[PDB]
Structures are given as structure tokens and as C-alpha cells.
Design a protein around this nucleic acid. Structure first.
Length: 677
RNA sequence: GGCAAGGGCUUCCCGAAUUGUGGAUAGUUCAAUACUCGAAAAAAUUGGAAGUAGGGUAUGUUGCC
């Protein structure tokens, strides 16, 4: 009853022996001391009454249903509670003495703060720990030979791995349901108390199932259909419902499979995704590409936040060249509520069939995936030979129209999600509305449907009928035009139900309006702060540095930072408008200062074991500073301020790097940088 | 590198019953393991399409002439 260490001593020991690559003999006596330590820890485990320990330390509260995300317990308090659990579980011997106990406790806080697929290399996490203080690593307390030292070194690393990978993780799951937030700017995790989560889950899913789901009988499990697992993701104040496809079939689920059937089901899972599902996604993405090339109405739909900024920058330059100045623009920002949930399944089906109505019933499309071209709408090496490309090979897949349409409707209708109740009995639900979020084809389905919707419902726009800007990223819409007659027509059909034929319901409350009367200083459409009456954009504070994950060397750090700076310094940020450098130099300064000090922060941690090469870093500074100037002159096509922009770069570099003895070389070099002669 | 210890691995047995400071026999080898930088010819540009010599870092490296 509520015990952290479920596995037995033998199973635990075999888990670390396999990890460390150790294969002891049947007569080995080295691990006698460890078997004793485990028994003491398990004795402390059973003696602990964690239920009252949680109430004492954390405290029990009533389930909040108004703000469903308030139930989460702060990570700071979570870290302290597990540190209390570890102190009762692990004797001093398990910590490796006083000095190691301080280091190990410090590393636990580091591990718990990572979140969202962040990892710390075990060479970093387990560094500075005195191996000598771990007496139980061998039957003798003293190290005598090198074979003994190597063997104890492997065992200690395996033991430390079990503490963090098995023990620490199983403590978190016992008390908290750990899940990722729906946000993309912040990759922090939410720790909802386990008893509170079951109340939130049962409440939300039961209400959701009333409008979106249809309960299935137990004998639906015997059918082979797409099967996922219903989970909840809190965005900031409510829950998003997604479905994660399970790596097995409906019949074999819940749960028994152990005798290598779990692996062959997983080999069939990855096969179905790579042989039919992903090939279908390519074809469906390709069919939408042709409609983008053909119709200007399909070209209004973009597939990235970067395209939105460029579309606005193109419209700004259109008014600029045509009129010399930006007139009073009528802006219309609206979005669709529950876009994926409300989708009209039958209308989606017919729009997918219209992609193949031009061709015959058996067209036999050929697909052969290569990461160099999946979504485009540098040295690829194919033609294997006896000199250049010398069981899971790359092969061309042939899918006919009939099969493509059959698997499409299967991913729309036949998908079934499972819900395990309190007792354990699973409840299988089919969907009464649009596709489940989390399935590979659900994204492209909404793209084709909504891009078809904008085509025919807004056909008045594409009749010339010119001088307007309509853009739909995924579900948020934006319209900018000086024509008032265009403003009224789009607003008129938003007050109607013409869009309700599709799974599109306008979010009436979140519709932002800027017109001749309602004059607002600026509008945030998607992660961008578009300034009204000049169409100058500046990115909202919605992007953080990934650096922590997997980067532990100067080479890999500057490699990402270089590719990160050049990827975030896109065209729409360098626009000058012939008078304004401030909107550029301090827009660039934000990205520049944040990437430079991010390098300084990781510097002190990784310089302890790595070797810093100043000349290589100066080349990195030169590459990004050159890229900034060439991209500034490219976008504006004229440079009234290019020397001023470089002067800003140098001042930033000379400021951030005037503290350390090794940064001195940077300061002297950067001041010599200049474009003009 | 010589001498003196002691040890690791491998094998057998005695205890325990998810609670080992127990005994014995032969073989083997006892200072490095991991990580990160990284040269020198005829010049670059580059290190994952996975790098020597030689460095740095963490954990370590018996007493005695």
C-alpha cells in the first residue's frame, strides 16, 4: 500500500548490471553489500506512511474546478517534498557519506527542474562524487587494484542511474501526474497532485464526451481500428483533449502483452506509419500544394508564423509603392473556437475526394520520402552505387486513390480512444465530430478543409476586388484593407452561419476589431506585435533558448546559437521604412544580447571540462554580424544606416564581453570591424 | 624498474529465505576509466558521415630502496 520501491532486490540489481554493462559470475560476492543496503532502504520504504506525509508537508485541498490549472503544486515545493522522501528512504551509506550527500542533493534539484524532454549528461550530473566514500561498492573498503576501481566505477554510475531514472521518477509519479503544458514559449512541466488529477480528468472528459464522443460497446475491442489514448493538456486555464496513438492493436490492448508481442506490435506500428500513413500525408500535402500554386485564395493560407509576418511586410510595401504612405487600414482579427473538435466530418471527406476527382479511380501515386522535401509549398545523395552509398531500407511506395481515401476516412471516423476509469475498466469512445488532435493526418485534414473554406466562402474577395490582405495561419484569421466595403462584407458573413456548414465557429468574444472609430495602437495576431497605421512588426516575447538540452560542448553550443540567431533574424525584422533605425537596431539587439549572454551563462558551467577557442568564437561573431548586415541590405534593398547598424552590433559585443580575461581578445578585435572604407 | 605485500576477476562450498564482516581451490592481472580538446609535410577550408602524438577535466593511482 503506497510503496515507492515495488521491484525486488534481484530485479533491481539486474537493472543496474545491464545498464553498466556488467556480467558478474554466478559465484560473485561483490554485490553482497549492495543487497544489504537495498533491504534497509526497502525497510524504510514500507515503514513510511506517505499518505500522511503528503498531507503534513504538501497539504490536501479541495479540487478547484473554476481555474482547473490552479491545482498544480509549485515545482519548488515538489523538489522539497521528494528531498524529504529521499532523506527517509536513503541511509547515510546510500548517499556515500556527508560530502557526497550534499552534491547528490544539489543534483536532484537540477534534474527536477529540467522538464519537457530536457536531459543532463550523466558525466555532468554525476561529477565530483567521491567514489572512495562508497564502501559498499565492494566487499573490501579500500581500493587496491585497477580492476577493482574500474568495476566499482561502473557499479557506482549504474547505482546513481537507478537513483535518478527509477527511484526518483517513481516517487514523482506516486504523488503527481506530470504532463507537458500546451504552450510553446515555455517548456515547463505541470505537477498536478494525483488525487486532484483524477477528479479533474473525470469531470472534464465526461463533459467533453457528451458533445464530442460516443461510447462504444465492449465488443468493439475485437475490431482492428485506429486506437489512441485520451489525455488532457492544460493550455493556461482549461484542458485540451488530445489522442496519442497506442503502439498496438485494439484486441491485444489492456494490457497483457509481454512475450515479445509488445515489440512486434511496435514494429507493426512504425511500419503502418511509414508505409501508408506518412505516404498519405505527403500526397495530401502535395495535392494542397497544387491548389496553392493554382488559386490565389488557397495562397492566403500559410503554414508558419514566419509567413504571416512576410505577408504583412508584402502588403506594407504594396501600399508604400502604390500610395507613398499607409492609409487608414480596417483590421479584422478573429479565430475559430475548438477548430479540431467542431470539424465537419462529411464535408472534410468530400473536400479530400475533390483532390482526386480530376484523376481516375486507380492512379497509383508513387511516394519515396526524403527529409529534404516534405513540406515545401542541400546535398541530397540518391542513386546508390559501388562508390558512394556503399533491413529498413528506403523503398518507393505505390498507393492507389481507393486506398488513400479508405485510410483517410479510417483516420476520421474509425479512430477510437480509450479511457481507464478509477477501477481500471477501460471505456472506448468513438467520435461524433471532427478528428482527434495528436494524429498525424489531423493537421493536414484541417489545413485542406479550412483552405477550401476560405476559397469559396470568401470568393467575393478574389474578384478584383483588389487591395486587401486575408491570411489564415491555422485557425486565427487576419484581414487588413483600406476599403470599407471589403471590411463590411467579411464582417457580415462572420455574423452569419455560412461558415457553420464547415466545422468553423467564430470565437465571438475574442474577435479584435480596429476601424475608423475603434482606434487601437497595435494588434497581436500570432506571436507578433503588428503596429497599426504603419504595419511595422516586432516579435512578442514568445521564444526561449533550448540551450540546456543536450548541449555540453562549445562546438555544439555555438553551432546551435549560430543556427538559432540566423533563423530568428528573418526579413520582417530589418525593415527600416527609410526613417526608423530604432525599430531595427533594438529589435536586433534583443536577439543579439539574449544569445550572447546565453553563451556567457553556459560558459562558466562548461569551461570546467571543455577547452575554449577564442579564434573559433570570433569567427562565430563574424558570421552572425556579417549575416545581420547582408540581410539588412537585402530586405530594404537600400542601406541608409548599414554603418549605424554595425556600430550597434560592435557596442553590444564590446559591452557583454568586457568582464572576463578571455573575452579581452574579443573586445580588441570587434572594434576593428567596419563595412565602409 | 627491482623487491615486498594486498586485491580484482573466474570457479567451488557454507549461511539466509527479497535481512552474509563465513571457508576453500586454482588461473588471470593490478593504474587507469569516462568526457573534451587536438597538432605538426605543399596551401587552405573543415571533425561525427565518428581523430594519432600530446593536452585539459571528473573520479582514481600500496609501503619500501
Amino acid at each position: 500500500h503506497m510503496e515507492m520501491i515495488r521491484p525486488s532486490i534481484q530485479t533491481i540489481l539486474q537493472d543496474i548490471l545491464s545498464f553498466s554493462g556488467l556480467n558478474p559470475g554466478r559465484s560473485s560476492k561483490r554485490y553482497r553489500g549492495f543487497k544489504s543496503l537495498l533491504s534497509r532502504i526497502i525497510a524504510n520504504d514500507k515503514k513510511c506512511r506517505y499518505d500522511i506525509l503528503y498531507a503534513k508537508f504538501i497539504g490536501t485541498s479541495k479540487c478547484n474546478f473554476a481555474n482547473v490549472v490552479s491545482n498544480k503544486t509549485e515545482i519548488s515545493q515538489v523538489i522539497q517534498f521528494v528531498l524529504l522522501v529521499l532523506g527517509k528512504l536513503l541511509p547515510l551509506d546510500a548517499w556515500g557519506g556527508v560530502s557526497n550527500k550534499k552534491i547528490i542533493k544539489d543534483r536532484v534539484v537540477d534534474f527536477l527542474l529540467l522538464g519537457a524532454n530536457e536531459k543532463i549528461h550523466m558525466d555532468d550530473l554525476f561529477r565530483g562524487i567521491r567514489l572512495k566514500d562508497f564502501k559498499w561498492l565492494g566487499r573490501a573498503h579500500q581500493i587496491s587494484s585497477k580492476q577493482d576501481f574500474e568495476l566499482r566505477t561502473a557499479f557506482l554510475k549504474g547505482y546513481l542511474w537507478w537513483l535518478f531514472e527509477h527511484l526518483l521518477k517513481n516517487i514523482l509519479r506516486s504523488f503527481w501526474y506530470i504532463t507537458e503544458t500546451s504552450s510553446i514559449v515555455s517548456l515547463e512541466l505541470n505537477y498536478f497532485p494525483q488525487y486532484l488529477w483524477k477528479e479533474l480528468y473525470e469531470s472534464w472528459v465526461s463533459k467533453y464526451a457528451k458533445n464530442n464522443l460516443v461510447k462504444m460497446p465492449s465488443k468493439i475491442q475485437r475490431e482492428q481500428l485506429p486506437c489512441g489514448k485520451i489525455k488532457l493538456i492544460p493550455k493556461r486555464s482549461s484542458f485540451r483533449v488530445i489522442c496519442v496513438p497506442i503502439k498496438r492493436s485494439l484486441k491485444l490492448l489492456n494490457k497483457k502483452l509481454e512475450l515479445d508481442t509488445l515489440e512486434k506490435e511496435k514494429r507493426e506500428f512504425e511500419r503502418y506509419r511509414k508505409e501508408v500513413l506518412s505516404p498519405v500525408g505527403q500526397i495530401l500535402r502535395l495535392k494542397l500544394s497544387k491548389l496553392r500554386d493554382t488559386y490565389e485564395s488557397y495562397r492566403a493560407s500559410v503554414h508558419s508564423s514566419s509567413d504571416v509576418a512576410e505577408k504583412i511586410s508584402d502588403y506594407r510595401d504594396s501600399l508604400l509603392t502604390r500610395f507613398g504612405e499607409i492609409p487608414k487600414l480596417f483590421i479584422l482579427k478573429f479565430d475559430m473556437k475548438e477548430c479540431y473538435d467542431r470539424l465537419s466530418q462529411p464535408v472534410l471527406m468530400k473536400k479530400l475526394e475533390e483532390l482526386f476527382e480530376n484523376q481516375d479511380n486507380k492512379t497509383s501515386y508513387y511516394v519515396r520520402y526524403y527529409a529534404q522535401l516534405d513540406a515545401s509549398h542541400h546535398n541530397l545523395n540518391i542513386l546508390s552505387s559501388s562508390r558512394h552509398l556503399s533491413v529498413d531500407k528506403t523503398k518507393t511506395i505505390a498507393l492507389q486513390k481507393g486506398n488513400i481515401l479508405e485510410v483517410c476516412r479510417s483516420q476520421i471516423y474509425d479512430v477510437v480512444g480509450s479511457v481507464k476509469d478509477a477501477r481500471g475498466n477501460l471505456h472506448l469512445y468513438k467520435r461524433k465530430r471532427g478528428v482527434f488532435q495528436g494524429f498525424s493526418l489531423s493537421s493536414i485534414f484541417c489545413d485542406i478543409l479550412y483552405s477550401a473554406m476560405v476559397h469559396d466562402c470568401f470568393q467575393f474577395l478574389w474578384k478584383s476586388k483588389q487591395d486587401f490582405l486575408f491570411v489564415r495561419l491555422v485557425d486565427d484569421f487576419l484581414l487588413v484593407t483600406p476599403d470599407s466595403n471589403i471590411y463590411d462584407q467579411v464582417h457580415n458573413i462572420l455574423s452569419g452561419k455560412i461558415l457553420e456548414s464547415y466545422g468553423a465557429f467564430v470565437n465571438k468574444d475574442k474577435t479584435v476589431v480596429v476601424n475608423q472609430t475603434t482606434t487601437k495602437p497595435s494588434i497581436d495576431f500570432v506571436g507578433l506585435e503588428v503596429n497599426t497605421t504603419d504595419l511595422s512588426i516586432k516579435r512578442n516575447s514568445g521564444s526561449i533558448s533550448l540551450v540546456t538540452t543536450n548541449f555540453r560542448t562549445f562546438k555544439t553550443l555555438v553551432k546551435y546559437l549560430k543556427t538559432f540567431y540566423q533563423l530568428n533574424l528573418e526579413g520582417f525584422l530589418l525593415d527600416c521604412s527609410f526613417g526608423v533605425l530604432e525599430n531595427v537596431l533594438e529589435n536586433m539587439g534583443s536577439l543579439l544580447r539574449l544569445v550572447l549572454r546565453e553563451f556567457k551563462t553556459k560558459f562558466t558551467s562548461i569551461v570546467k571540462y571543455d577547452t575554449f577557442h577564442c579564434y573559433k568564437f570570433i569567427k562565430f561573431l563574424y558570421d552572425i554580424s556579417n549575416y545581420t548586415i547582408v540581410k539588412y541590405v537585402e530586405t530594404n534593398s537600400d542601406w541608409d544606416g548599414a554603418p549605424e547598424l554595425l556600430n550597434c552590433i560592435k557596442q553590444i559585443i564590446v559591452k557583454e564581453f568586457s568582464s572576463f580575461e578571455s573575452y579581452s581578445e574579443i573586445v580588441e578585435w570587434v572594434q576593428t570591424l567596419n563595412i565602409v572604407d
